[PDB]
Design a binder for this molecule. Structure first.
Ligand SMILES: CNc1c(F)c(F)c(-c2cn([C@H]3[C@@H](O)[C@@H](CO)O[C@@H](Sc4ccc(C)cc4)[C@@H]3O)nn2)c(F)c1F
Length: 138
C-alpha cells in the first residue's frame, strides 16, 4: 500500500551484489509499469512493461541522457498479468542489471551509465498496487 509513483533512495548508488526487490500487484486493465534507476535527471536503466503497444505486450528497456532516450532493448517474454501479484528482483552485477520476475530470469541490461555509485534513486510508477520496495546485499 505504498504511494505510487514511489521514490526509493539508493544510498551511495548501486554496487554489484545489491539486490532490489519490488513486490506489488498489477492493477486490472493495466497499461504500463516503469522502473527508473536514476542518476540525477538521467535514467540509467528504464524498465518498462507495456501491456498494449499495438496490441502486443512487451518490455522496453532504455537509458535517458540529457533528456534523450537511447536505443531500445526489447523483450517479448512478458511475465506480468493484469490483476496479479508479482515480484521483480533487480540484481546489480558488474556489467549489467539482471532482472528476474516471479523467480524466473527475464533479462539483462548492460550498464550504459557507468558511474554506478551515482545511480542513487529508483522510481517505481505505473499501474500497480505497490506492496514493498527494498534492497539488500547478497
Ligand atoms: C504510468 N507511468 C508512466 C509514465 F508517466 C511515463 F511518463 C512513462 C514514460 C515512458 N517514457 C519513454 C520510455 O518508455 C522510452 C523507452 O525507450 O520510450 C519512449 S518513446 C521513445 C521516444 C524517443 C526515442 C528515441 C525512443 C523511444 C517513452 O516516451 N518516458 N516516460 C512510463 F513508462 C510510465 F509507465
Amino acid at each position: 500500500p505504498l504511494i505510487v509513483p514511489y521514490n526509493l533512495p539508493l544510498p551511495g548508488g548501486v554496487v554489484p551484489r545489491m539486490l532490489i526487490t519490488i513486490l506489488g500487484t498489477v492493477k486490472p486493465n493495466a497499461n504500463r509499469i516503469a522502473l527508473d534507476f536514476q542518476r540525477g535527471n538521467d535514467v540509467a536503466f528504464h524498465f518498462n512493461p507495456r501491456f498494449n503497444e499495438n496490441n502486443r505486450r512487451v518490455i522496453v528497456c532504455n537509458t535517458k541522457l540529457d533528456n534523450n532516450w537511447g536505443r531500445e532493448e526489447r523483450q517479448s517474454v512478458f511475465p506480468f498479468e493484469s490483476g496479479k501479484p508479482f515480484k521483480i528482483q533487480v540484481l546489480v552485477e558488474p556489467d549489467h542489471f539482471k532482472v528476474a520476475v516471479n523467480d524466473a530470469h527475464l533479462l539483462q541490461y548492460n550498464h550504459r551509465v557507468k558511474k554506478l555509485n551515482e545511480i542513487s534513486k529508483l522510481g517505481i510508477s505505473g499501474d500497480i498496487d505497490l506492496t514493498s520496495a527494498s534492497y539488500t546485499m547478497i
